Design an enzyme around this catalytic site. Sequence first.
Site, short mmCIF file in Angstrom:
data_model
loop_
_atom_site.label_atom_id
_atom_site.label_comp_id
_atom_site.label_asym_id
_atom_site.label_seq_id
_atom_site.Cartn_x
_atom_site.Cartn_y
_atom_site.Cartn_z
N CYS A 32 0.83 -1.20 0.00
CA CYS A 32 0.00 0.00 0.00
C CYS A 32 0.87 1.25 0.00
CB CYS A 32 -0.93 -0.04 1.22
SG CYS A 32 -1.76 1.48 1.71
N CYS A 35 0.00 4.13 2.56
CA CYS A 35 0.33 3.66 3.91
C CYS A 35 1.79 3.98 4.21
CB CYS A 35 0.07 2.16 4.08
SG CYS A 35 -1.62 1.62 3.74
#
Length: 106
Positions: A32, A35
């Site tokens: 991700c 993230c």
Amino acid sequence: MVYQVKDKADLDGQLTKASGKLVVLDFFATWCGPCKMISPKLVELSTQFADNVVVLKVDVDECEDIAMEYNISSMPTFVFLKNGVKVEEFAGANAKRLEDVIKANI
């Protein structure tokens, strides 16, 4: 001061250990992108507020049971727990929201 929970039992232990402090749960994945962009800002805030906040990271891929319990769909999702009350929650790599929500709960 960021710790990655290994499983549900470990999280429950970390929750009870955190006592009355604000717990920030960072639901994330290693693939991700957003993230990882917010990661350094999170780490900063955990050090900045070590005497008030416990930051736990939950790899959704490793602890799928936890991701399901918290109904994660977007990433990162920040869940904010205080004495078992899920006080706030939002998703996305929104540095300002992350800081505001932490400060609003201490």
